[PDB]
Symmetry: D3
Subunit: 330 residues, 6 copies
């Protein structure tokens, strides 16, 4: 718990826009979501996506069992109506009395981007941004947002799985493995603008810390751009709700050709990653040199955790200071 | 936790007589029941309903898997037989040896009333009685005992739901909400003989503390008496087993007209009440003036809990001293 | 928790050889097993059955999801290969670097006997042996290994059920209760070589402490030998995986006549034993003279628990010193 | 198919009044029922129970999915309203046009008696009555109507099972088999008023043809009257919906003592009777002298089948002519 | 069967393009579908959508269990490869022998349009076209293809339900009914170009015979165009697979607002339509004047059925001859 | 239908001996089985396995719900006892009366062989014998009888699947397909003693007509003998109960290595074979030269079916006359 408090300062995806619209016949929510073990409710009130604690101030019913009408989220129990700022603006039982100052629920940063809904629980450091997806607003590329997928594994373990190449021959032998490319090198890794940047051989990674990966592939078999954008919502201490968006230049083929392939890859990873125990990586794990990405990831996470304890300035420097290993200029 | 110790001093219903008779083909029980997280067993031993701890003194098997033999409860494992006082009177393997002095299980005050079985776990204060049901022994009324219904909510939250009128428009708009009588005002509430008494003008409540509600309705659409008796068994920290008995003066219609209607009402309340979290109301809940019944209820429970810590005489005064604010003469 | 640590010094069955061979198409395992709440993996590497902690040293994946490859157990994630001593001998991603000294997993004693796989978690006292089954090596007898049966009950409670005669009239009245022979006397019990030995007149028990029972019956209905070997794996604090092997001299009949009878007896015991609570017998249980076997059993277990605290030679003495009550010579 | 047409002339129970009142929240129905493979709908219109073909004349929707509205059954599709004679009296889409003469559905005899709803599909022979239940109107007796029980067996096979004593030692050895009274003799059987009447010494049968059995027991264990009334609804060619009403003079005990016993007896019979094949008894079945009751039953049924072909007065004579074997006077 | 043969001459939708692409990871099919009780397989071979009988010529395995590679559908059993014309072009067991002339399966007209796959089983009359959807290629309108929905009702009964207004007050009271528009008139109906054309008050219907409905609504509440395109696949004698495509001018709102509404309407219709029995409308159904659309629909279907028996010219005239009742010119 | 009458003249396996012993706790049966749509019962009566029609002569209950008593099969309903010839020898209700002459049920030739129970429904031609299994009574071979496996396919289609090599690349590419030995040629096939005999160079088939296959493999990868014996029970027109027995010379490996492999092979075949439709091969199937085994099999079955219509001597010649085309000397 206290060991995860620094994560409240980042933007995390909690649902797709589609999920929010499908939740109830109004198409406006509400939708219950869970983020860092906090129970939240999401709704569209007018033009705004709003996120509140899923707990009415009156008698603690779940607002996610209520109703969106226009610019209000109405509690299902005694009909208190909450506005976009989390403030109750109608107590139907006392329509002429003034509403208690108490009658407000916590309201959090909530924004749509790339077709996902993002929530930032703590905006006090004012230095984190929604992760970078390189294919957004590139009109050469067709974009597909997959349905979210749930794993009984943590966001850290999911991230390390996605950025590891050592596992292809054993988890993905028929699907991703390459006899003639069967142990890619140790590569230089740069920190720039709160992202890890590193390239392989052609795979170009931009990883917005802590849990998002933007992978641009310049493909060998077709010579056309493919982008994978994967981000894990840390739902609680043992669970992730994971999102994949993918973009492609050659878009004459079926979206489901790629969805089925992505789903096959995830199905091969899933049971092995869910088997890792304890859920959080303990100190006794044994790294080797080929674990560079994982080793550097864990080091930066540890530094961000320390810097959060020191405060806004220290956190901003730990996240945003550049640290360059490569020949590249940014 | 220790919050609930004072509740052990009250009589709580644990099952209907019908449930006890259906439990075992003999119609005498035994039946396993749970009350304030205690595992108990109820059986008809001779002319008496008896409650014991559901745990044999010999090797801890559940007596509820056993059988009533004569006027005794026989354990299923090695056949020890327990009398109405929880004392072992036969050890089949050693029929002539003396029975160990410790060969006994705790028993508890247990009585049938109104077709329910009631248990009081702690009788040491000796000032509580079985709640009041006004329709009992009224020849003019047909009485129907419904099957128990289980909620994932506490008895306090269930009580507050049953006595609140604010929620009709939102939970019961098609079934109970009167669009010409939305808000009855604050009414005076009296404490008398360990009951809350209050009237609307016609709904007359007599609420035997802590969890029983007797509601006499002098109906408007029929000019005839209807009585609802609702009481919650606090099974554990997050569960209630709830009992509804209803009585009616005009009794030539179908029982199932009313049962179906009550069931529909409970089905409307249930998911909202079960969503309330945390399960016990914290101090941060925000009341409005329309919540008088709930406010006064919580106040009295707090007083009973503090008086229990001060001992038998303090508790008896907190429970039984009158506090009148209406002009009714009792 | 610490009350059970002394049980780690004994050999416990964890699966049948059949279960191991059925686990994976290779017939070599791996198979996940759980013993005293430890997650272990069993595999056949060459001619050896091996047992390791089910947790890779690299990134903590379960080895039980991996593959046997010759004399090695290969992790499913990045293919680290472990030898019969639990030491990693191949890191495929770094195939010529020195393997970290840390790259080892805990390896436990593991042996086949009687068609079961046995594990001893702690071999430090070097004085325990796999329990004795008298029918092994006897060409006169046909041996049948039943499928394991799981109970929600501890190994101590299961052992006391199997060696008690008092319960027949109440649990097994149609099946084992002899109405003309309804109370076998208290018999002398010998401790010899870490076994309880006692005889009823014809039932000869050799009970390898703590959880195995070898029962030799010279039957009253055939003049033929029948052996029952029952042993309970203590899977965790509330669960047993139980094994029955039986042997018989007159073997021209169907194995399933006997299997169905054993299963019927176990089904009659099961719900009563599973109801016993709390799972471990508290000090408050009330014994009678007929309970001699379980009284003496509990005494010896407590002696073994005390001696374990005192260290290796106290434990050896408590386990293996003779204590003779009968007129028999050993 | 045509072999069963004569059964349409009798009254058959189709549901309990309780089932009808529970079907729909209004307590008035409608309820879908099936009798001799006809799909019917039952409803309470005013003070009358009505039974119609469950098929609207307009577009063939099921009226059982509709609503009772005063003295009318309203179709769910376009709201045509049917009166107690099955005639449409309102076409909402054409509220002042003349209603087509075709706008009528078949209406069948429907009456409540003993707490069951009875239907007679063909009243043309005007000689059948609702079966006789002797305990009705008797203030000395407490009456209990059990929930209906469904069997995969025909009404004839169920009737022959209920009136056979030969099967007790094999189906009911623990439950009804009297080892000292193991073969009741052949008894004289009288036909009187469309009933078989026969007596065993104390068991007095009055069997209203074809499917109802009234059994009056003067018990050997109390000197008290016990009545069993069993009747089978022939739902289709292989299914029965069966009804048991029982009455007892000594009524201070639990209803559920008796219900559980009846249910245990029925559960013992059920799989054997359901196994009988083909469902209707072929001519090749081999009778013995002990089968007198079922031999005479089969003879009378065949007589009724022959007489139905001959028309109304032959059937009346076959049903109601007396045929006396005993010394009794009627 | 013979009574449905005329339907083989029309184009019927059998799946969405999305369903075909999702069926297997190739994204090319194959997909099993059923049309007029014929088992068919659909695949994308190169650029073409192809439909064949789902039955290999060799040993009658289902081609729908096989694999699409490029321009071939490979049988799962012995790998015979079929081309876009249904001809086997590779017998892997006899790669040098010539392929039997027998080695071909029936191939049917198969075309994508509007995002659905359409099949015409009989092209011999050469005068039927894929039904008309007015919103196709109108760039003012956003188009949404719903997931198909299955009903246990025939295409005729589904069509008549969709074009009836009489049922709103009873099936759709809260969702479509209008007190102040509560019985729309009898309207003129034109036959033109194989479509029924009729308008209401503003609802404009173009119904391509036999099973498609294109409804253009000029809405009262928003003054913007909404188009509903509903077509029923006659899967067999009692089943429809139904498709809804809808288009809207005001497309700033959520697609799921409309999907949820359409799904609610269908859920209200579904149980009533599925209750209609027999599945095909028999002669005894009673029409009233307000049934004009249904009456005229059944008349044209009957004429098409007669004309099919007479041949191509007669069928073409029955389908395509104009029959004008309205003031309109086409 | 009448197509299958000739199959009644052959011996078919109906269950394993293990299945019979497991059916009832006595280990003697009875066990219900179905063969060519006949409902039969098998029991061990004394030293004999007996098959009767599963239908009591008295009131048609299933004898398979009864019990073996001594050397008789006792009906569950009224306890009639049937001897090994199907004759009733005890009528409990009339123990002294003469037993009706018709109190008997049909019995059928029934024998154990190889650990299976075989039944021949029609013994009148008296020229068929139980199929040949070459490994029986060979000391060098360990024999494993697998559990039966059920397919929704006919015995003919299952036989043709088992003897076809064409399908390996497509159904079994990972498990059986040899990429260097795809096509063995047409081989000569001999008819001898009612068996098909044919050899590949090493696979030697002896196929006892109609449904049994004995395959002797002189393996290449081990230089040791492996025998597969597969036989299908034609349960009804669309179902088979299939039996696999396998024998091996090198028998120090795990039985479950082989069982798992066989099960994987059957799992690969099963959905393709079950998809073949219609269930019986019609005349429109297209054979190629590689189908010789299947072509010759169907030819011989057609001859047996025609010879059966001509009578006992014609059938005996069709079945037993030799037809040699190899140069082997028998
Ligand atoms: S709990 Fe939300 S309005 Fe009362
Ligand atoms: S545990 Fe109850 S008698 Fe032994
Ligand atoms: S977790 Fe085992 S090899 Fe990496
Ligand atoms: S189908 Fe009943 S009113 Fe139309
Ligand atoms: S059944 Fe299709 S290739 Fe043989
Ligand atoms: S039916 Fe078998 S003994 Fe009566
Ligand atoms: Fe992966
Ligand atoms: Fe309520
Ligand atoms: Fe036991
Ligand atoms: Fe019976
Ligand atoms: Fe509709
Ligand atoms: Fe195969």
């Amino acid at each position: 718990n206290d060991e995860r408090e620094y994560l409240r300062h980042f933007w995390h995806p909690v649902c797709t826009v589609t999920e929010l619209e499908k939740a109830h016949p109004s198409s406006l929510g509400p939708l219950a979501v869970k983020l860092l073990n906090e129970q939240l409710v999401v709704a569209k009130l007018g033009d705004e996506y709003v996120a509140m604690r899923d707990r009415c101030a009156h008698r603690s019913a779940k607002l996610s069992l209520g109703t969106v009408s226009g610019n209000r989220l109405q509690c299902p129990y005694h009909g208190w109506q909450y506005d976009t700022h989390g403030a109750c603006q109608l107590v139907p039982a006392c329509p002429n009395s003034p509403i208690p100052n108490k009658a407000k629920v916590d309201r959090f940063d909530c924004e749509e981007r790339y077709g996902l809904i993002w929530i930032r629980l703590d905006s006090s450091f004012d230095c984190t941004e929604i992760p970078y997806f390189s294919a957004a607003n590139d009109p050469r590329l067709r974009i597909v947002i997959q349905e979210p997928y749930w794993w009984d594994a943590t966001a850290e373990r999911r991230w390390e799985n996605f950025t590891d190449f050592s596992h292809f021959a054993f988890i993905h032998p028929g699907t991703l493995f390459d006899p003639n490319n069967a142990e890619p090198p140790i590569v230089p890794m740069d920190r720039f603008n709160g992202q890890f940047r590193f390239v392989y051989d052609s795979f170009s990674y931009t990883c917005s810390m802590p849990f998002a990966i933007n992978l641009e592939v310049s493909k060998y078999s077709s010579s056309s751009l493919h982008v994978l954008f994967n981000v894990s919502c840390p739902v609680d201490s043992h669970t992730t709700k994971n999102f994949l968006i993918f973009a492609r230049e050659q878009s004459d083929d079926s979206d489901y050709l790629h969805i089925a392939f992505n789903d096959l890859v995830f199905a091969e990873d899933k049971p092995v990653i869910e088997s890792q125990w304890p859920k959080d990586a303990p100190a006794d794990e044994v790294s080797v040199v080929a674990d560079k990405v994982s080793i550097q990831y864990r080091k930066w996470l540890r530094e961000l955790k320390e810097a959060h304890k020191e405060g806004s300035q220290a956190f901003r420097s730990a996240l945003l200071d550049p640290v360059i290993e490569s020949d590249r200029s940014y």
